[PDB]
Amino acid sequence: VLPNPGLDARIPSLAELETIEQEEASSRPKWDNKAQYMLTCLGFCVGLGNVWRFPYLCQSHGGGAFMIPFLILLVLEGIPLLYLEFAIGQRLRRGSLGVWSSIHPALKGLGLASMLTSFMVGLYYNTIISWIMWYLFNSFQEPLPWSDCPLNENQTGYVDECARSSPVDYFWYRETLNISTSISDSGSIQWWMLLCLACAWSVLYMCTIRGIETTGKAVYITSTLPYVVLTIFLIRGLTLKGATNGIVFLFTPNVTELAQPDTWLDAGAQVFFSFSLAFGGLISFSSYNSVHNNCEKDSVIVSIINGFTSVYVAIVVYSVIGFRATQRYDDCFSTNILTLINGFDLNVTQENFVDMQQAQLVFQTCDINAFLSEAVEGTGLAFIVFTEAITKMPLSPLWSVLFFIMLFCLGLSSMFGNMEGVVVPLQDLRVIPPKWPKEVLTGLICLGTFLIGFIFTLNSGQYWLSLLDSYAGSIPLLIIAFCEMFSVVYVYGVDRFNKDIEFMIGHKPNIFWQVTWRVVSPLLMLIIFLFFFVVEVSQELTYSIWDPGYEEFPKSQKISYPNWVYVVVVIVAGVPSLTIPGYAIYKLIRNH
């Protein structure tokens, strides 16, 4: 509809697509089976988010009710866009920088944005994988290292900070991170953190050394193992006393939460990341399929599995949350019973305590709801909540190994996608001599992103990661995804796209696809974009700090970010969003 001339003789023709696959047998990779392509896509979509983000939001944003906004946006934005990304990739026979550049020369910024976003996300996400594999290395010992406090130098009692806090909280903030009191206090590189960072980047080079050719064998385990382990954990969790109590907790409906601009923003930003859209690895992975693959049925199957996985992992996480809260509650009541029994020389059971007890004595009032409401979101759930719950289970060191290989596999499959998103665009820019083998490029990305990830091994390195994690996604992905849908409907033309799809699948997209590609999806992507600048003003950009030497130390302490932090937020959220106009102003005044 927008007047872009010279579009033919810049893309392959439909007449020429029947002959292009018997000549891209050489010089282009090709899946070995359809299952391999299907798995790699699943691993990209299913990630650590489905463990410590989606289950939290499901409850925080109205348990069971959150399903409404999540499923609405899933079928109105997720599937619709996922299809647009699978189809355009399989039709244009190129990755993300390839496709947008071909549709219109000024749309290159779109490709650049997707590559930048993929880099920024992969940088911090592999750092999380570095922390996962730190815990897994410490998961082969009868007494898990987060089971007990370290003794004082005098061994009179436990270390003060562990004493005031918890052995688990102590193992994360002091023995893993060695965290600082601020983002402005930065120290040295935690050598053990750097070792694990090395391990993470090295494990990812080996799977991505020769592209899909090597990642295909990897996804057979990286995308399957997590389902087996997630299953083994569901049968174990349900057996544990207190589970079901935490399932009920997840699925209690608070409709009032639906009437909130913060609910749909999260539900909206969750679908995009859960579907790994606007990263431009799904376009690259779809380009390797045959020109006549059904990419309409592949987008529905992936998106069904994505929506079933999200709920299924939430059932596993809230089974542990309910066992861990049922354990603390019983421990608390036992302590209160002991106080009365010892103080009054008393027998006393939860059934007969309040009646039995009826000034010197102190009773710590505790409610299961309060223990259940202790569920957090983001790493904390894995490094604090689960790690604690697992120490109170039989065969502790075997449930820890299985939980941290599962998280490892989740993270690693996601990394395959992000790496596809950084390397492919680099080969289309032709930054390195094309003569160079693929291993060289992938090895220079894996070594260059490793060296930048030393910022997160500083003592302040978790404060930096919590900032990038809150800005790397959201705005950039929302704007990138809005312009991919715009560029595929108003610039390439939705009429040429229907014809093309009819060419491969054999028929044209139905009215559902037409309605959502033209009017609905984009409109639904503007109100999520307007919600962002509505909630942002309430952010106050404040970050929680540990600060052992602080009043109510174990209590949350939120401090405002230093003014210079705004520069960081502008660079990680703005530059990947202003390259889309920025390259389009540069190209429109290089011709004139």
Binding site: M133, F137, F140, A198, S202, V203, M206, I209, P437
Partner: protein
């Protein structure tokens, strides 16, 4: 413990990984 368990596991895992990378780099060279 005489050696930190995490370091010995780290040791064995890194070992396999690098022996993974060596072979993969060489298999590809053979493919050439």
């Amino acid at each position: 413990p005489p050696v930190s368990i995490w370091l010995i596991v780290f040791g064995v895992v890194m070992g396999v990984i690098v022996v993974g990378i060596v072979i993969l780099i060489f298999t590809g060279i053979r493919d050439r």
